[PDB]
Structure formats: structure tokens, C-alpha cells
Amino acid sequence: PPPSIRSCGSQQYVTSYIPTGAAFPPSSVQDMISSMKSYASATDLVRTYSEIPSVEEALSTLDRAAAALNARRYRDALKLYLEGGYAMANVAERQANPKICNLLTSKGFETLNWCARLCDWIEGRIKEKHPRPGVHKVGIPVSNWDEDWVGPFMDEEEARRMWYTPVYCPHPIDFSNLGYRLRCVETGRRPRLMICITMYNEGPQQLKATLKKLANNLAYLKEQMPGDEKSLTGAFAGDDVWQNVLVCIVADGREQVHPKTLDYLEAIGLYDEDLLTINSAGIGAQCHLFEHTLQLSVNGKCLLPIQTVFALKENKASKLDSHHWYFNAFAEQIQPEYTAVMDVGTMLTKSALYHLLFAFERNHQIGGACGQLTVDNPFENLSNWVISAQHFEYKISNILDKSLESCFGFISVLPGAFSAYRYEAIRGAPLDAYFQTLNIELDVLGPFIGNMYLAEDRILSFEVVARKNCNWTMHYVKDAVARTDVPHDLVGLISQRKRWLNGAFFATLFSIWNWGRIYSESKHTFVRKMAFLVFYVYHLLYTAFGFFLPANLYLALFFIVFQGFQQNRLEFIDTSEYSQTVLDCAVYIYNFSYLFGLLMLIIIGLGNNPKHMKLTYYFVGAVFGLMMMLSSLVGAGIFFSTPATVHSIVVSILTVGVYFIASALHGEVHHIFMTFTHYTALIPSFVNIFTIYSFCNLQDLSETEKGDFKDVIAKRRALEELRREEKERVENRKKNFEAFRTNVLLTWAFSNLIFALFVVYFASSSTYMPVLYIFVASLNTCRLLGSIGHWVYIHTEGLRGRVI
Amino acid sequence: PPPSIRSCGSQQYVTSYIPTGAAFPPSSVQDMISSMKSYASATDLVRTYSEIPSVEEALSTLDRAAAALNARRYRDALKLYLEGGYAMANVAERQANPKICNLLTSKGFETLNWCARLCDWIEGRIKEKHPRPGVHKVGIPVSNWDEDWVGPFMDEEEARRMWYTPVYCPHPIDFSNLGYRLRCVETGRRPRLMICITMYNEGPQQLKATLKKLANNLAYLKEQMPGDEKSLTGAFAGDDVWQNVLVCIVADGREQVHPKTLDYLEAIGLYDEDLLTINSAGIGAQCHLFEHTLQLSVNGKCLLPIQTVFALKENKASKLDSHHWYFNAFAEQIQPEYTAVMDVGTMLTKSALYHLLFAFERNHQIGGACGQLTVDNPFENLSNWVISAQHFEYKISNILDKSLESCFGFISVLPGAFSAYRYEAIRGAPLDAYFQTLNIELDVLGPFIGNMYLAEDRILSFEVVARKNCNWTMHYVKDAVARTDVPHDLVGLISQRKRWLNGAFFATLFSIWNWGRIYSESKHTFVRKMAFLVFYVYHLLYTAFGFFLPANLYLALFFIVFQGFQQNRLEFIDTSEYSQTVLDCAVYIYNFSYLFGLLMLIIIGLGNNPKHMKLTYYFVGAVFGLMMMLSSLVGAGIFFSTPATVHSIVVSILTVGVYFIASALHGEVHHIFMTFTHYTALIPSFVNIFTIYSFCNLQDLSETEKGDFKDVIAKRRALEELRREEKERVENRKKNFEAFRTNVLLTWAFSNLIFALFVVYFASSSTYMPVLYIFVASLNTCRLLGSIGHWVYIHTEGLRGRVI
Ligand SMILES: O=c1ccn([C@@H]2O[C@H](COP(=O)(O)OP(=O)(O)O)[C@@H](O)[C@H]2O)c(=O)[nH]1
Ligand SMILES: O=c1ccn([C@@H]2O[C@H](COP(=O)(O)OP(=O)(O)O)[C@@H](O)[C@H]2O)c(=O)[nH]1
Ligand SMILES: [Mg+2]
Ligand SMILES: [Mg+2]
């Protein structure tokens, strides 16, 4: 018998006893149910409220329907889809905005048709695998259209209408199989060059500058006369070049996109929030792609139209995921000839694309090319030391390293922007190895492959060069200048260099380990293999020298400056005087200051993020810079005081003047003169701070419908077990990666410490400095020879290309 | 005019254009709607499927209803609640299990009554604030009941029925206002002692042992004869003590509770999953509380019944949150006289509760007491060095520190288990300051208060002692022995000591800073204030000495051992011989090994969690232990070789033999003899490893119903803005806490380094060692005097308490 539970929910507190022995007898619950009339009032109120539907309710029901369909429960999905479709169809009449009314009507009809198809599938009449709502792209007039704009010729359908479609494709390789198409393919156009602009959390100005620069490049390509020896022929000839270029702007996530960037994109007719909100309600799309042929006008001059596809991903991922989508989906569908990759904010000169295409067409053996990277407005605000140091570093790195590596046809491209490939060398295995992380969990790959983060460009380069049964070489184009924007403070530079150094070190180790594939698998000429062997020996020596850089810097400074002051080896001054306390005071001050600075740096770097420790980083950098400037002045005095000899002048030239000689040979000598002083004061800061922080922060890295009660309990237990197992797996992965990074850091730090201690204790300045001079002179001589060879090639092969 | 969109969802790919200029004309959409018949088939299939309801659907609808009600949308909540109630009422008939049928019927009726009340509230007839479903507790027969069990007397309602209720109370202070009651209050019983057992991720064995020990304590309290001078009187007298004790088992979260623990709890009639799943569907409770009077039988002996309340929190929180719930809700409702707190696994002896209650009743000035903490089975498995070291540490800490601090009536209770208070001293301000973190966000409090993590017990102790207009002192009971289980490896010890050291250091700083409140605000006797001033001076000296412990240890070892070997100061051997290379080799080996070990330790501690670095920690600990054992042997030889004098023997006694003297005075001398050797080998490990890791890881720490389209857009924009602001706030908080911890670590490390360097360079062994000996002898003499005073008090106040 049921107890007196008539008022158990209404009253604030009720205590009841429920006997579970033999259940409640029938004919008693019915009387209690029929004896209550307030339920009728509640039902009447609910029905009256539920007569009128709403947009928000319909969208929520469609979202729940998509969630149910993703869980492979089809009856609930069908019911929710029917409810949402009927709700939207009823609501569409009430709306006063014509655009909203039309979009709601179309969405309701589409949802109802999908419901009918799903019902047919459930009944068994239609046999398919993993049914999804049919793909449907909607074209709408652009809100803002410039009446006064002059272009070559634009069909009204292409000129005034922007197209939108949501894509659910989980693996981008299936983009063309699921039935998705692009406007270029439908219209019959077959673009031959594709440019990708990865964007994440950026202001409108950078995107505007990038688009203007691309339009200028297209105009320059159009302007060139035909029939010249240096003019390109074919698709990129003239008066139709804009039809052979497609620009893909891939964003990283709706959550992190700057709102002003979205406003600017909507201004140029490449984004609309109402269409995205309505048309993507039930699909549960992974990405949303808008398509347009944007027409940009700057000041009183009208630019050429640019065919643009803006792909906005729903959830945030890495840049490698953006390249995954771009390459696989768009490249496999369009099947272009070339493929250029650049970041947002990279401003190109008028001739970058022309030079890239000219090299690709003339050589026919180049599988990839990279342009020169420069700092925007270096001379302006020259009082900033960080900007000038970065400018000097970029110029020297480009000239020496790029020339030397491009002589042998193998380039380890610097991170960031403006690298072009041809979609024949990279289509197969190189791209499969490029996207290895995105397809295989880091548990299977291991710690070494996982820690190769943000170094995927070097992996792609090495895969292209060492591809089996093919001989593809890389090239460096000096005239394809791309200007970027660099951080103006030490903290951003520290973070950027952390990323760069992690990637560079582990990619270099991978290349050194796998260099044998060039001889074992690739098909090159014998001379190419011998040249690659020579470059391999040079690369081993260079990496080994770079690993021991802090110890060598400390030893050089200590010996020269301070054991010249203490032991009377400075030539311009005599220290045979003095009380023997000042000399030891200087040596001890140097040692203690260096040790304390290194300890503070390592503690801070391993400890916390370098944004709230700005003052300490600035203080350590200033101390090291003053020390380096004093050492430079002392060394200059020592060198000038000596009457000099053949050995002295040869070593001085091959050590210091190689930079000036190469810069003068290439014509970029004024930048070196302006920025050498600024770069000199940051060498210890660069080496110590960046390497220590990079090593310390290495850890940073990425179906029952109804059921009964027993089914519910089993489902909940299974869910809890799966959640706990996943948590344990993630913990184990983090533990392994942290252990690997700690082992690497300990090895590096203790190797450097032991080397420095042994050289200090068991070696003199007379028996160590000549070895360092020989090593540095040899490396710089090799780099200078490489630069001269590249210059000779680039200025001669045009004249001597007739014979061979 | 609408385009040909008849087949847009069914077909795989359809491209359509939607003109937004002037909307679609009427009389055309109606024809298309009425021209489609597949929608009728889909509707028929959906209706046929939806005729039959299910348990899972009803539970999901009720959960969604609770979610809607929490968002203050009442129409949707009413509609979902009605649907769920009707679904459950329809389903309840189909079930075959009588318990499930009865529970479903009761839940359906309760939900329908709540729907009626909510409808009345919406219509305006009933005026309330924040309506919620009415509180309803359900009593069910226990699944397993022991027929053969003999007890004092048990009403069948109390003996066979277990009660359950879900609580939604967001702020536990409102527990009694919302209408919740406990079975003890309803039955008329008024328990005078409450015991809290906090549990999180523990095996059944620990809980079983704790419950058995509590039952043994109750039996011992019952057994004592009346009329004796030492026997308690009143509630705890005899034959009814079990009615005056309530045990609250507070779990930390359903997700992290060990499944075997839940099985054991269900075995003893304190948990049931079906009742929890059904009765908590729509409430959205914060916690679930089960109530029973459990009857435990071990072997052939039957234990006394224990009144138990098991409170299981839905989501995981800190132990401070469990104490928040326990203290506020249960203590404020029941209003007990005492309040004991212990962890799970703490096994009490037969006389712990008797001694605690005896002290509380006899003294009448004690506001809090703590029992002795011991290691379970210390002699067993004596080959383990960590267990013996922990046993020695516990014994020495208890004796010396607890006796000295309890002489002055102010105890800084060690973390973990078995502390009792009286619910008159702590009811007001002390508990408000105890729960300060749980009520105020860490942004307002600042970094210093936030970093005082896991130190709340010391805060409560100091608040009790320094409470305004009151004179409450603390006490240490030696005979209330509680045995715990200690980690058997170095990694668990490292983590445990990290928590303990963070809490202890910041609580000590807080107490030192706020010590003035005792004189400014409290109301003590003049003699008490003078004694507190003396203890304050001693505490300052002890903390200052403890801050510089690594440097002093290094200096002592270096000077004595190695500058005895190098400079011929070992008395049992002569080093005037030797080549002058072995001596410097020994000194350099010591310095380099110590520096490398410290560098490795700090890098590992700041770097990664100490579970995958087990081998390196073990290696460093072994090296330090061998060094300490060698130093101990050398020091023993040096001391024995000297013929000795008054100063030597006095310093030796007051430095080393204080431990043995105090242990022999208190009778616990054999433990010291057994474990002194094991503890000696871990002193450098303790100091260096635990302090470094603790400092390094200091960072670780804790409404529109319908709307239109514009409303939806505004709502989504507001949600995105709020999410981004919250993310920024969390980032700023993390940055501030990390900066504070890094500053503290840098200050500590560099202070120790500079002190050691200056003492090494500018001081000799003759001018430094006597100062260290004086300091250590003074501290140990003060501790010995405190221990002797406590022993005299505990053995005399019984005899001399008649006069005063
Ligand atoms: O998680 C991210 C971070 C950045 N980027 C984009 O990838 C490029 C490189 O990012 P970043 O500016 O950080 O490069 P860096 O300046 O550090 O060399 C830029 O276009 C970013 O917008 C991205 O797609 N995902
Ligand atoms: O997040 C937590 C961790 C622990 N505990 C409980 O609080 C007590 C102290 O935990 P622990 O065993 O970690 O203490 P320790 O052994 O570290 O001193 C034990 O009863 C735990 O079950 C808790 O309530 N919440
Ligand atoms: Mg950039
Ligand atoms: Mg414990």
C-alpha cells in the first residue's frame, strides 16, 4: 500500500518510507492519479505556452539532433530533426526581415527532406553507409558592393553573389568523395597556383596588407610584355593571370578570431553571421567555407579581383591541421601545379611571385623554393636594439646559410612564411610523412617524434629531397623578398625563439639520423651523392660546434679578457703593477657574476612564463650586453696594439670580415654596417637565454535507444571506466614527454659544464685559443665559399645555360 | 519566387540561390508544403516509435529540466518536468522488479506534485523566492541484515531501514533553513560528540579498520565502572554511550571513489545505486546523504552499533570543502559539545577517546587537543630505512615539539588526522577565518593567503588561541595514540612532505606576522601574555635557524670532516704526510659532488613530477646517505679520540643526548635506539630534497524563454565575451601565483648560497664552529626543558590540582 505521499513535492520537507518487498497493489495508483486536478492546470498552462514556437528553441533542437546523430542513435535524431524542421517552418512566417525569412524557409524545407530520406533509410528501402544530411551550398547577394569599381570582366553571378557551405568531412582526404565542390571547379576554371594564408588571432591591418600585396603581385604579373626572353609564358602570361590564382584563407577557430577581423571580412563580402548561424544548425559541421571573387579598392586605385576561399574551422587546432585541410582537400580536388604557403602579415614585393614562378619554370628540377625574409622598416626607429639585432640576424642567416645550403640543393627552411612547392614532388610520401602526427597518436610515435614540434617544414624538405625513385632538389631565390613584422621586446623574442629552437634542434637530429636514405632509396647522380656527403660532413661539424656554444663563449671571454688583465696579456696596458688583489677580484667577479646569472636564468626559464619576469630578463640581458661590449672593446684594442703578421691578419679576416665581404659581394652592406653594433651586444643573450629557455620548456606540446534500468547502470559504469582509462593514458603520455625533455636538458647542461671545467683546469690560453681560432676560421671559410659559389651560379647560369 | 529546392536534403549535393531582396510571396509555400507526402510517413513512423517511453528518456528529460531550472527559465523547466513525470508514471507499470516499480511510482508522483506547485507559483497564487522541488527523504529496507547479531536494543525502524536524501544546498550555512533534517534530530536523540572521517580514493580495508577501531573505543567507554575518580560522568558514562556519538563519513566525489569501497559501503547498508539514480533525477543535488545505525560484526564478536551519516558529494573539491559541509551544516544543526576530526585509515587505540574527553572535561580551559601520531607496525619490516626514519621523526617531533608548545598552551598541529575541538571556542570567528578561501576568490585575498594551502589547521589553532574576549588554550594528550600508514618509498614521501612544508612555512609566517592579536585583542592573564612573549622569541629564533639549514649543514660537514682531513685536524689519524694532491682532491671532490647533486635536484624538482624520476632521486639520496654516514663515523672518531673536557662533554650532551634523555624520561627509548641509525642517513636527503621540491612546486594550487534572432545573436556574443574574460582572469591569477613562488624560491636559494660563500671565504673553522655549537645547544636545551616541564605537569597536576 502506497503511503500518504499526496503532498511530498509541494511541501518543503516530507519523510516517507517505501516498502520494496512486494510492490504496490493495482487499482490504488489509478485512484490517486485520477483524484488530482492540479495536473490538468499544469498541462493546460504548458500547452498554451508551447503553442507558440521560437527560433532559439528550433536551433537548440537541431543542435541536439546533430549530437544524437553523431552518437549513431537514429530514432532520436529523426524525431528531433522533424521537430526542428516543423518549428523552423512555422517560425519563418513570423519574421519581418526578408533575408531571415528566406533562410529559415529554405532550412526548414531542407531539414524536412533530410528527415524523409532518413526515414527511408531506416525502413531499409535505401541502403547507404553512415547517412548524413545532404550537402547544400547557398549563394546570397553581398551586402556591400562597390558600384564604382573597374575590372577586366565579371559575370554578375560571380561579381555580386557570395557562396557558403558547411563541411562535416572528418578526414580531409574524403572531401571530394562526400560530394563537396568549390566554385572554381564548378565554373570550369582550373587555377594553376594556390596560396594559403594561415590566420589565428590577428588584427585586420595585417590581412589587409597581405591582400593588397598579393593584388600588387598579380598586377605586376599582368603588366609584363610578351615575347621577351625573361617573360613567363602560358597561364601566368598576361590579361588573365587573376583567373589562374586561388587564395585560401584558413582560420584556426571561431572562438579565437579577432572580432574586428570578422567585421573586415564581412565588409569585403567574405563572411556573414546570420547565414552561418542558420544554415549550419543541424549539420554539425567541422568547418565552414565561404567563396567569393573579392574586388579590393585602395585609395583611388582599383586592384585586380582575387578568387578567395575563406575556411573557418569550428574548433581550435594547430597550424599543421590548417595545412592538412588545405593540402589534402583543396589540393587533391583542384590538382594545381604549384602551391605557395605564407603566414598572415607577410608583405611581398611586386616581383616575388614572378621570381618564384620563373625559377620553377626554368629549372624543372626544383621541388621547392623559399624566398628571402626581411624585417619591415629596419632603419625606422633605429634606436631599438632588438629590431636591429633581428635585422642583422636575418640578413646574415639568409646570405650565408641559405647560399651555402642552396649550392648543394638542400635547404632547411627557416620557420615562418613564404615557401613554395610544386604539387608533383610532395603529393605522395612526403605529405604522408608531413602529417604523421595528425594521423597517429603520440603514444605510438614516441617522445622523440612528438618533441619535433613546429619543425614539420624541415621534415617536408628532407622528404622531398630524399624521395625514392626521384631526384628533387631545393632552391633559394634571393629576389623573392617578403617583409614581416618582428617583436619589439625581449619577451616575445624569447617565446618565438623557444618555438624555433625546439623545432630546429629536433629536426636537425632527425635529418642527421636519416641522411642514409638519400643513398639507399633516392635516385640521384653520383656527383650529387658526393656533394651531399660533403655537406653531411659539414653539417655534422656545424651541429657539434653549435651544441657546445655557451662553453666556448665563456672560455673565449674568460681567457682573452680576464686572463689578459690578470696575467698581463693585454698589449695596450701593463698590469705588472697593482696589489694582486684587484686582479683576482676581477677574475672572481667575472666568475661569480656569470654563474649567478646562469643560475637565475635557468631557474626563471624552467619556473614560469617569461611575461611577468620582464624586469629580471631585462636586467640579465643588460648585464650580459655590457660585458660583451667591454670584451669587444678590449679585443679591438688588443688586436690593434699588436704590429700584426700573416697569421693574425688571415685569422682576423676569416673570422670577422667574412660577414662584410659576403654582404659587399651581394650588395647588402649598409645593413650590416648599421646593425653590427646592435647585434654584437646581444650574442650572450641570444645564446644563453634562448637555448636555456628552449631546452627547459621542451615539455610544451599538444548507442541504445530505449534500454532498461540495468542498461542505464551498465552504460554509466562503462562511461566512468572509459573516462578513467583516458585520464590515465594522458597522464602517462605527459610523464614520458617530461622525462625525455628533462634527460635532454640534463645531458646538455652537464656536458657544457664538464667541458668548461676541464678546459679551465687542464688547459692554458696558449694551448686552447689557436684551436678555437682554427675551428671558427674553417667554418666561416666554408660559409664564405658557399656564398661566393651561390653568387657565381645566380649570375652565371643565365649566360652559360646555353651549353648545359 | 522560391527556387527548385524540392530535392535539396535528399540529394548528395545541391546548389541553390536564395534572393533576400523582397522575401517569398505567399500562396506558393503552402502548395509546396501540401504537395509532399513523405513527411506524413516520417511523422507516422516517429509517432509509432514515440508511443512507448523508456526509463533512460525520462531520466534525461528530468536532467534537462533540472539544468533549465538552474538557469532560471521556468516555462521550459515546467514543461520538461511534466514530460518526465508522465513518462516515469507510465514506465513504472512495465517494470518487473518490485523495488524499481515502487521507486519509479513514488518519483513520478513527487515530480507531478512539484509541477503543480511550480504552476501555482508561476500563476502568482503562491509567492516564494527561488522555488525548488520539495525535500523528500526515502527510507528503504537494507538489502543485507544479520539475523544473528546481539546489541543493546534496536527499534526495528532504526535497525532495518536506511534513509536517503539528496541535498541541493549551495551554501552549507543554509542547510537547516531549506528544511533538511537528520535522523538523529528527528528521533529525539541529541549526540554530544561528532567524528568526521574524510575519504577520497581509498580502499575498503582502511575504512573497515577505522570503523572497527571506533567501535572498540565505544566499547571501552561503555565498560568503565561508575563512581571512580577517573571515570567520566554524564553522557559518556556507560550503557548508552553509542547514542551520544555520531560519525560522519564525507566522501570527496562520486567519480574518484574506489568501486570496492562502494561495494563495501553497500554491504554494511550505507549505499544503494538504484535509489541514488532514481530519487536524484530532477533535483540536481550538490550532495547525497545516507543515514543508518550500522551494526558491525568481526569474527565471532559483535561490535556496538554506530550512528553513521555518509555524505557523498557529486563533484570533487578539497578536503576543506568537506570540512565546510561537515562543520557548517551538521554542527550548526545538531549543536554538539565536542567535534573530532580524523582521516580515513587512522586506527585509534582503545583509550584515545577516553583520554580526549577526560582532558576536555577536567581542564575546562582547553579549546582544542591533539593526540599522538604513530607509525603502524614500526618494528615489522625493519629492513626498510624510510619507515624507520619516519618513525623516529614522528616520535622525536611529538615528544620534544609537542611538549614544549603545549607547556605554553599553543600548538601548531601537524598535518593529518585526530584533532578534537569543542564547538564553543570555534563556532564564530575562528571558523569564519578557517573557511576564508572557500568564500572569497583568490584574486581578492592575494598570493600570500592563497599559497597558505593545506595549512588551514594552523590557522584554526591560532584563531582559537587568539580569539577576542576569550582565553582558550590548546593541549597535547600523550595517551591518545593514533596509528597511521606511511609511504614506503621516497617518491610518496617527497610529495607528502611537499604539501606539509608549503603549508607549514606559510602558516608559520602568518602566525609570526599576526602574533600581536594575542595582546591587542585577546583577554588572557598577564602571566599568559608574558609566557606567550617568551615563546614568540623562541619561535622567531627557531624559524630563523630553520631557514638557513642547508647552508649550516654544508658548512658543518665541510669544515669538520674535509677541513679536518685536508688541514690535519682529525685526531685519530695524521695527514702531515701525503702528496698535497690527495687532500685537495678530497676537498674538490666534496665541493663538486655537492654542487652537482644540488643542481640536479633543483632541475628535477622544478622540472617534472617525482614519479618517473625515481632512479635519479634514489641515486642522489644514496650518495647523500653514504656521505652522512661517513661524516658520522668521522665525527664519532674525532670525539672519542679527544681526552675530553667539561665544555666538550656538556656540548656533546646538550647536542646529541637530549633525544635519548627525553625518550628515556617518557619511556619511549627503545624506538630511538632502533631507528636512530636509519634516521641519521636521511638528514641531508630530508633537508635538501624536501625543502627544494617544496619551494619549487609552490605554484600548485586550486534567462529568456522564446527570443528572436537578434536576441540569439546578442546572447551568443555575450557568452563569448564572458568566456574570454574568465579565461583572461584565470591566466592573470596563475601568473601572479607563479611570480610570487619564483620570487620566494630565488630569495631563499640565493640567501643560502651567499651565506655559505661568505662564511667559507671570510671565516675559519675556529671562529665559526663554536657559534654553531652554541646555537644548537641553546635550542636543544630549550626543547629539553619544555619536555621535562610537560612531563612534570602531566605527572603532578593530578596530585597538586586539589589546591589550585
Ligand atoms: O595556434 C596557432 C598559432 C598560430 N597560427 C598561425 O600560424 C602562423 C605562425 O604563427 P606565429 O605568428 O606564432 O609565428 P611566429 O611569429 O611565432 O614565428 C601565423 O599566421 C598564425 O596566425 C595558427 O594557425 N595556429
Ligand atoms: O583531494 C583530496 C585528497 C585527500 N582527501 C582526504 O583527506 C585526507 C588527507 O589526504 P592524504 O592521504 O593525501 O594526506 P597525506 O597522506 O598526504 O598527509 C585523507 O582522508 C584523504 O582521503 C580529500 O578529502 N581530498
Ligand atoms: Mg607573423
Ligand atoms: Mg592517510
Swiss-Prot record, chains A, B:
One of its GO terms (molecular function) is chitin synthase activity. Changing D252A: Abolishes the catalytic activity. Its EC number is 2.4.1.16. The active site is at D457. Pfam families: Chitin_synth_1. Its cofactor is Mn(2+). It catalyses: [(1->4)-N-acetyl-beta-D-glucosaminyl](n) + UDP-N-acetyl-alpha-D-glucosamine = [(1->4)-N-acetyl-beta-D-glucosaminyl](n+1) + UDP + H(+). It is found in: Cell membrane. Changing D457A: Abolishes the catalytic activity. Changing D343A: Abolishes the catalytic activity. UDP-N-acetyl-alpha-D-glucosamine binds at T198, E202, D252. GO terms for biological process: cell wall organization; chitin biosynthetic process. It is an enzyme of class 2 (transferase). Keywords: Cell membrane, Cell wall biogenesis/degradation, Glycoprotein, Glycosyltransferase, Membrane, Transferase, Transmembrane, Transmembrane helix, Virulence. It is a multi-pass membrane protein. Disruption phenotype: Reduces mycelial growth rate by approximately 10% and retards sporangial production and zoospore release. Also leads to significantly reduced virulence. Induction: Expression is low in the mycelium and during most infective stages except at 48 hpi, but increases in sporangia and zoospores, and peaks in germinating cysts. Glycans are attached at N381, N471. The activity is inhibited by nikkomycin Z (NikZ). GO terms for cellular component: plasma membrane. The chain crosses the membrane at residues 500-520, 542-562, 586-606, 619-639, 645-665, 672-692, 744-764, 769-789. Polymerizes chitin, a structural polymer of the cell wall and septum, by transferring the sugar moiety of UDP-GlcNAc to the non-reducing end of the growing chitin polymer. Involved in mycelial growth, sporangial production, zoospore release and pathogenesis. Homodimer. Belongs to the chitin synthase family. Class II subfamily. The chitin-translocating channel is located in the transmembrane region and connects the extracellular side of the membrane with the intracellular reaction chamber. The entrance of this channel is formed by the VLPGA (residues 452-456), QHFEY (residues 429-433) and QRKRW (residues 535-539) motifs. This is Chitin synthase 1. It comes from Phytophthora sojae (strain P6497) (Soybean stem and root rot agent). The lineage of its organism: Eukaryota, Sar, Stramenopiles, Oomycota, Peronosporales.
